[PDB]
Amino acid sequence: MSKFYKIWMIFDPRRVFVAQGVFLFLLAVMIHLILLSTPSYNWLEI
Amino acid sequence: MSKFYKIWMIFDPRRVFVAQGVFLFLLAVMIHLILLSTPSYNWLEI
Amino acid sequence: MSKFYKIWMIFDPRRVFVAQGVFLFLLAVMIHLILLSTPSYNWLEISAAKYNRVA
Amino acid sequence: MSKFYKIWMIFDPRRVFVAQGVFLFLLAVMIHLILLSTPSYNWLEISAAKYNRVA
Amino acid sequence: PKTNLRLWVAFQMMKGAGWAGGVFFGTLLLIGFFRVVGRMLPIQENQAPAPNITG
Amino acid sequence: PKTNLRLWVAFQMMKGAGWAGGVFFGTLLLIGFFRVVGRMLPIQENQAPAPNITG
Amino acid sequence: MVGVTAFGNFDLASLAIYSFWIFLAGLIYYLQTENMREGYPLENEDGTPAANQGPFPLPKPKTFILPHGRGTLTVPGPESEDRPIALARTAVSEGFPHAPTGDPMKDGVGPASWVARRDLPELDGHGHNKIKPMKAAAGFHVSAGKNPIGLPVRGCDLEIAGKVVDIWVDIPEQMARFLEVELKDGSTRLLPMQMVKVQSNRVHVNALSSDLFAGIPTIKSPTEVTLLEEDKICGYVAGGLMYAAP
Amino acid sequence: MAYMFGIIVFLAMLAVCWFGFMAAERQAGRL
Amino acid sequence: MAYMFGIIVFLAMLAVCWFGFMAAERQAGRL
Amino acid sequence: MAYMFGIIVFLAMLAVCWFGFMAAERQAGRL
Amino acid sequence: AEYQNIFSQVQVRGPADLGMTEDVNLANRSGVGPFSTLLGWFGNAQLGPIYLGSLGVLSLFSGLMWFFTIGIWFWYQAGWNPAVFLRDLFFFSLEPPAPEYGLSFAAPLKEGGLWLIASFFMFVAVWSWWGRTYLRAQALGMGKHTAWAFLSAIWLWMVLGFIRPILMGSWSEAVPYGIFSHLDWTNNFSLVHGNLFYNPFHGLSIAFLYGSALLFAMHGATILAVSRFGGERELEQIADRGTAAERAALFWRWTMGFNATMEGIHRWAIWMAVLVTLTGGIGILLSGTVVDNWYVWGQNHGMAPLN
Amino acid sequence: LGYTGLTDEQAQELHSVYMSGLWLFSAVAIVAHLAVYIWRPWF
Amino acid sequence: LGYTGLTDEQAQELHSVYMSGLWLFSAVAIVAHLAVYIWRPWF
Amino acid sequence: GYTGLTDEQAQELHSVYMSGLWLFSAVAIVAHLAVYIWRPWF
Amino acid sequence: ALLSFERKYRVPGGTLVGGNLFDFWVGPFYVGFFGVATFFFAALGIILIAWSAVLQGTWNPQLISVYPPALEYGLGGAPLAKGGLWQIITICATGAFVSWALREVEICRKLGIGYHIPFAFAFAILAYLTLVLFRPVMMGAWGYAFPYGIWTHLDWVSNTGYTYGNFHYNPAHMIAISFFFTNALALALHGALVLSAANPEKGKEMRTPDHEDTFFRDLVGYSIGTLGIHRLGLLLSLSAVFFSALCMIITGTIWFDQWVDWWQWWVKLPWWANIPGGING
Ligand SMILES: CCCCCCCCCCCCCC(=O)OC[C@H](COP(=O)(O)OCC(O)COP(=O)(O)OC[C@@H](COC(=O)CCCCCCCCCCCCC)OC(=O)CCCCCCCCCCCCC)OC(=O)CCCCCCCCCCCCC
Ligand code: BCL
Ligand SMILES: CC[C@H]1c2cc3[nH]c4c(c3C)C(=O)[C@H](C(=O)OC)c4c3nc(cc4[nH]c(cc(n2)[C@@H]1C)c(C(C)=O)c4C)[C@@H](C)[C@@H]3CCC(=O)OC/C=C(\C)CCC[C@H](C)CCC[C@H](C)CCCC(C)C
Ligand SMILES: CC[C@H]1c2cc3[nH]c4c(c3C)C(=O)[C@H](C(=O)OC)c4c3nc(cc4[nH]c(cc(n2)[C@@H]1C)c(C(C)=O)c4C)[C@@H](C)[C@@H]3CCC(=O)OC/C=C(\C)CCC[C@H](C)CCC[C@H](C)CCCC(C)C
Ligand SMILES: CCCCCCCCCCCCCCCC(=O)OC[C@H](CO[C@H]1O[C@H](CS(=O)(=O)O)[C@@H](O)[C@H](O)[C@H]1O)OC(=O)CCCCCCCCCCCCCCC
Ligand SMILES: COC(C)(C)CCC/C(C)=C/C=C/C(C)=C/C=C/C(C)=C/C=C/C=C(C)/C=C/C=C(\C)CC/C=C(\C)CCC=C(C)C
Ligand SMILES: COC(C)(C)CCC/C(C)=C/C=C/C(C)=C/C=C/C(C)=C/C=C/C=C(C)/C=C/C=C(\C)CC/C=C(\C)CCC=C(C)C
Ligand SMILES: COC(C)(C)CCC/C(C)=C/C=C/C(C)=C/C=C/C(C)=C/C=C/C=C(C)/C=C/C=C(\C)CC/C=C(\C)CCC=C(C)C
Ligand SMILES: COC(C)(C)CCC/C(C)=C/C=C/C(C)=C/C=C/C(C)=C/C=C/C=C(C)/C=C/C=C(\C)CC/C=C(\C)CCC=C(C)C
Ligand SMILES: COC(C)(C)CCC/C(C)=C/C=C/C(C)=C/C=C/C(C)=C/C=C/C=C(C)/C=C/C=C(\C)CC/C=C(\C)CCC=C(C)C
Ligand SMILES: COC(C)(C)CCC/C(C)=C/C=C/C(C)=C/C=C/C(C)=C/C=C/C=C(C)/C=C/C=C(\C)CC/C=C(\C)CCC=C(C)C
Ligand SMILES: COC(C)(C)CCC/C(C)=C/C=C/C(C)=C/C=C/C(C)=C/C=C\C=C(C)\C=C\C=C(/C)CC/C=C(\C)CCC=C(C)C
Ligand SMILES: [Fe+3]
């Protein structure tokens, strides 16, 4: 750490958190879809 | 609705919302388990 | 090497960190997809063959 | 050869450094992809054979 | 109080993820509509030959 | 502001559902530990007869 | 000629396709340099000539000869802003926005921008004022559609700003080009016809709150509008979409 | 057909949610 | 056996999260 | 034998990251 | 929702507008036609006046005779029956001479003579319309861009009906006059020449045909988007650049990194459209004369896989 | 620098709020990964 | 010379924190490469 | 000059640029030498 | 670097997402939130195409071809080498095209212009999604989509068309073609007419829009006008793409046979079906 908190003096936290919510949701969807595309992990094929 | 808001003068909303969070989570888990117990909906049996 | 800090006198950090952020995510995603494209290194299929799942 | 520093009188370093960054990345990606296309040099397929990792 | 700051960061992220979820599931329901109409039509009887040589 | 009241109700419910989630998944991991130890032991070889007449 | 090659696989259809790639590269160079007759040379944000002017050179000057004695235009040419711009940098680096230093609607910057066009009317082919109030062109009348004259004009705040008192028509094109609105002090303004919705009982101006109608730049003659005045009016109204606050 | 009637039932349910949600923003818009 | 080594790896990861979470409550306990 | 030597190389790489990180922290105190 | 300027809200009608004189021989210009309130919602309401004169009469009479010659053949193929004429209207076809007749004018009237007669009236009608398109611009002192643009379409049409039949050595190569039959001809042409998709000039011609829909969508949407600034008055924006032209230029510069001008976008427009039929005409002229199987030509030129 | 107009103390405070949630979110993720690895391991 | 407006000491400040992140991120990555090489070496 | 760099600003900036060039190529030479040891291409 | 008039327009705001976090330019290009999204998907989709070229084993750019999953995979996932790369590149294409439209909406807001351009572009996106998504989902297999390859996607057009005989007989395909040809006619005329006024005979003054109206009235007895022609060029382009999408969404979902056989409904109308003579009698 030491000074990693200084990122909030470069980038406006309000905007970053909204943009990070979009990223993390799409990353989660991406990984679920990678697994759903794989036969040994397609839980929706019952 | 009319006067249903008066329930917050009977029961302390702070306590009700915490108790309602517990209820809704356990209800959700219950229904997922009912489905997981049923062969045509057991998505975890891959 | 002791003057490489002067890069921040050439380029504004607000643009550089955005560019780097996209770059590092893009590079990582392509390497994972390249390995998943490869039968020797597709970990999800290595585990399926290991555990006698659908392969 | 000592006056090569006058390149920066002609070309703005902000343009050069961005252009250079793009160019060197795409060249490196080009060469790594060419080798992955080359069976004698595809390190993933070489190690697959070395360790009998399929069939 | 620090808790109001905890909840404000959560709220900003749920704004982002909520919109991204609205587009994802809204797309999935549009795909669902075309799948439902595909089920209503006589397509499995009259199923067309594959147009690509990969099959 | 009304938004601070929206987030306070969400926070109270997430307190409840978070604790209820912690006991559910904590139980599921305790069950997981006994399943992992069951896999390590020679039980499938020496599998016991059913103790109930329903089988 | 079928199958006849000069060398390799190079038949007469190869000669054609390679000749076309040379023609296309020449044509694209011609097209892009023609499109550099406005807005070049490129500038730094301070206004000095940018060290990077891009790969294409400026074309040789052409001269347009303007009708009705209005002189000649040479392009490319000396191309100053010819007006003050009330903007200040928000960063020392290039590529960031410049924030309005005062009231951007009235300073005329951003989407409220306007250009120092010629302070004369646009003319028709005969040399009459192209755009006129309809009362000043006796044959004209509203031949179909809801006649707006006499309707109240509502802002996006949903309050009445004024009433429509005339239509300003493009004479050669025979189309409605502005609505004249009489405000609550009896001074009028022109509204661009494309910025208003002529509803059944009202004209709705979604760009302006009812107070902002007094700020609309006024025309100096009540019987004609200059190209400079048009740009100021049209710019100001469109600027409201960004800058009209609730 | 009479299956897709159910798809419409869910859309009727989702219209009730819209009417309820906007009403909840009305019946105390401090109003 | 050498599978359950992985179960321990996840517990090591979860101890790092605890150490990080408490540190985050320390390095600005207004402190 | 590139297994063993591989382990060593990765452990050598990490020692350079330790040097560089401590060097950065040795700069970052307004040195 | 706001106003999009796609249909007009209010129509105004002045007097009839007779238009510019310049060097137009005004005796040859008709009276003004009626106004259409329907057209006024989308564009101008005024019909007419129209200029006739010498190349006008020549073109309109030859074009009438072309149309009438086909129509009578269709009435004959219908057996004069007015019901069959409407049933089979899209199935009638005036076919060119059979291959055994080559280029000779000796084919019987029912075996291709009427197709030559019809094609002669088409030839005169189209070429006299070209000269009319040149001279109407000359009388107004305008540039000849419209006549030179029309020459690019004539090039493809001449290749289809005249030049390639001559170079192939029979009128049987030409297009039949008929709704479905010119479609059957178009399909059969591609099959005989081994899939026309692998003709590179058919590929180019499609690129410019898609590009013309791309570019007119971009340009039409751009001008409507800036029409609130009077950007549809493009000649005054060329003479005296307003905020409309600058906002249009900066939209595309900020979007795709480069932009046109108000004059220069119409050069992109004319060339994108002209190149459709220029490259098209070349691609047909090469078909059968130089390449008889485009798919195999594609295999030898690195665009299809080898067998 | 100081492009956002936060003070240094405001930034130190907010970063701890953010970091506390980061370790919580990743701790929940580890529990979900540990559950999945017990049920259906991928190594 | 400065195109960004950062003073020299500000640039040294920003760089030293930037390099801390680079070495940290690259350390985490080496441990991932080490684990993967232990599991399935590519040489 | 077009950039407006003074001669000393250009000569300063070149010296640091040369340092990155020699560093980057030095790493690349180790990478080539390793792969030539591992699998010669000549 | 700026156009000489550009500076007065580079104000803050108009962004739909991200506020000022991405409200900056990179050379001429505006970035914004969706510019970041656009570049990521564009770069990923391009790079996965180059990687598919490695798996395919060609470097000739005209032979590179990324095929969709075979019909045996249905609408499920396929292996990356065998259709799964196509699926990810289709996601990236959709992400890039949609982000590009949304980035255009932000630029419209900052310049205060109408939204006609991103709205028109959304028609092209829907035609793309018809061919890769909606129609394959209706027909039940990703393999009915076209392959990403310069010439191999023309094989898909050919093979899809000839599945239904001559595809010229699709009646919506005929209407789409009529708009496509008419649009190209109107673009030739509009370009030429504006240029002929701005570039008259040598020594003459610039012509007015009155001369433009006059030339076309003299030529054809009508003139749509300066505003009408830009409405027409937009609607002709959009109609062409609407009827193109329509012609395909019906093909293989409600119509299965040779399209030429459709036109018999007119021939066999009972008031004239049996009348002797003609072509069909
Ligand atoms: C299948 C058929 C297809 C067919 C494809 C379609 C073909 C038919 C359409 C033809 C359109 C012609 C386009 C044109 O006129 O270009 C000149 C014009 C002039 O702009 P300018 O403003 O007056 O001058 C340039 C400069 O002053 C702009 O400002 P600045 O210097 O501050 O920033 C630079 C720009 C982009 O500039 C460049 O990338 C370098 C110049 C490119 C010239 C291209 C033509 C000549 C060289 C071609 C061979 C160059 C070989 C190296 O902004 C940035 O750099 C910011 C970073 C974002 C861009 C990253 C790009 C990464 C590298 C990707 C590879 C790019 C290759 C050009 O604009 C530009 O220079 C930038 C254009 C960027 C988009 C071009 C898209 C069209 C296709 C590629 C170019 C045409 C050749 C096919
Ligand atoms: C099975 C069918 C074949 C095929 C066979 C052909 C053939 C054969 C030809 C084309 C040609 C064309 N094809 Mg192909 N084509 C196929 C598949 C396609 C596909 C697709 C998605 O699959 C597309 C988009 C196209 C697209 C096109 C165009 C780019 C091109 C025509 C340009 C033009 O403007 O013509 C329309 C314009 C004209 C014909 C010019 C007309 C000008 C004259 C002067 C007008 C006179 C008017 C008259 C007097 C009437 C007046 C009435 C007034 C009211 C007064 N083809 C397949 C592979 N295609 C042509 C070409 O150029 O090929 C290279 C061509 O000859
Ligand atoms: C560059 C490529 C594009 C192109 C360009 C183009 N075409 C052009 C032009 C240009 C630039 C013109 O200037 C020219 C024009 O005038 O346009 C308005 C033209 C034109 N493009 C035309 C058509 C056309 N263009 C096409 C395509 C293309 N045109 C390409 C897409 C197509 C097709 C199939 O794609 C067609 C059908 C025409 C509208 C026009 C050429 C007109 C012409 O030559 O007409 C000859 C025929 C006649 C003059 C008359 C025919 C018969 C009528 C029924 C009149 C009868 C009158 C008589 C007195 C009646 C008496 C009745 C009695 C019983 C009383
Ligand atoms: C709807 C009417 C017409 C239309 C309109 C239209 N297109 C538009 C616009 C408009 C109004 C824009 O604003 C926009 C633009 O910016 O234009 C410059 C655009 C545009 N129309 C384009 C192309 C295009 N339009 C076409 C068609 C049409 N566009 C219609 C006919 C066609 C074809 C084949 O008909 C093409 C190729 C672009 C120039 C541009 C959109 C640029 C864009 O999306 O940029 C972001 C994405 C990238 C830079 C690259 C993405 C890379 C992918 C992730 C990987 C590649 C995947 C792809 C599926 C591979 C295909 C291989 C082929 C061989 C099959
Ligand atoms: C809190 C949230 C809780 C969520 C709970 C879980 C919900 C899960 C269900 C979601 C419901 C909707 C799913 C869609 C409809 C459906 O049932 O489909 C089920 C079918 C399976 O059909 C199969 O069956 C089909 C027959 S049938 O439909 O069953 O009759 C058959 O035709 C097909 O071949 C076969 O594969 O699959 C699909 O339709 C595929 C979905 C594809 C989505 C990803 C696309 C990636 C590929 C490239 C395209 C990219 C496009 C990018 C666009 C941005
Ligand atoms: C503490 O500070 C931080 C570390 C948080 C920030 C530091 C400073 C900073 C500003 C960093 C910036 C980094 C950047 C700019 C990173 C950018 C990353 C990108 C562009 C990631 C993109 C990811 C995309 C994904 C995962 C896409 C998924 C799409 C899927 C799964 C398809 C299904 C989804 C949908 C249908 C919804 C979306 C719509 C379409 C059309 C796809
Ligand atoms: C055993 O086998 C079988 C299951 C098959 C057979 C079972 C047979 C059997 C014994 C069934 C018995 C069923 C019974 C006894 C059902 C009774 C149901 C009742 C009594 C339901 C009542 C519901 C009441 C409701 C939902 C009331 C809601 C009230 C509201 C929302 C208002 C709450 C209060 C306020 C807002 C405050 C008001 C004002 C002030 C000033 C505080
Ligand atoms: C609109 O109305 C208001 C929200 C304002 C409330 C109105 C006023 C009011 C006070 C209503 C009160 C209602 C009451 C008291 C309802 C009580 C309902 C109960 C007791 C529901 C219980 C549900 C239990 C469930 C769904 C259990 C699920 C268990 C599962 C799925 C197994 C997994 C669970 C665990 C590992 C934890 C289980 C618990 C323990 C202790 C081990
Ligand atoms: C086609 O077939 C194959 C691909 C198989 C083979 C052939 C490919 C081929 C033709 C390759 C050609 C390769 C070439 C031309 C490579 C050229 C490489 C170069 C010139 C690399 C240069 C690298 C330079 C670097 C990394 C410099 C970095 C500089 C740094 C880090 C410092 C920057 C300066 C400052 C921060 C100082 C700022 C100063 C002030 C006062 C503020
Ligand atoms: C192709 O690749 C595959 C798809 C195969 C794999 C993907 C490969 C790849 C490149 C993955 C990259 C992943 C990355 C870089 C992930 C990064 C994730 C990060 C940085 C996550 C950080 C999350 C931080 C959070 C959630 C912080 C939240 C802070 C908050 C909310 C404030 C504090 C508040 C609380 C603790 C209480 C919250 C409130 C309530 C009511 C519970
Ligand atoms: C198929 O092709 C292959 C994939 C095989 C090609 C492989 C070849 C190839 C081209 C690879 C390329 C790899 C490259 C170029 C990798 C480079 C990676 C870099 C540059 C990584 C850098 C990471 C840096 C980090 C994580 C920095 C973090 C900084 C932080 C956390 C601090 C942020 C700033 C502040 C807190 C503010 C500081 C102070 C003040 C006063 C504002
Ligand atoms: C209501 O009944 C009435 C009789 C009153 C009217 C009926 C009207 C009617 C039903 C008309 C039907 C018209 C149709 C369906 C026309 C279709 C035309 C089509 C689709 C034409 C397509 C292509 C034509 C081309 C490419 C023609 C090119 C011709 C050229 C280049 C001319 C070449 C010239 C010659 C070969 C002639 C050479 C002769 C001499 C003497 C040198
Ligand atoms: Fe135009």
Author numbering:
A (entry chain AA), B (entry chain aa): 1 to 46
C (entry chain AB), D (entry chain AC): 1 to 55
E (entry chain X), F (entry chain x): 15 to 69
G (entry chain H): 1 to 246
H (entry chain ub), I (entry chain UB), J (entry chain UA): 1 to 31
K (entry chain M): 1 to 307
L (entry chain BA), M (entry chain BB): 7 to 49
N (entry chain BC): 8 to 49
Sentences copied from the publication:
The dimeric reaction centre light-harvesting 1 (RC-LH1) core complex of Rhodobacter sphaeroides converts absorbed light energy to a charge separation, and then it reduces a quinone electron and proton acceptor to a quinol.
Here, we focus on those interactions that determine dimerisation. The detailed structure of the dimer interface shows that the BChls of the two LH1 rings are brought together so precisely that they form a continuous, excitonically coupled chain of pigments, allowing ultrafast migration of energy between the two halves of the complex.
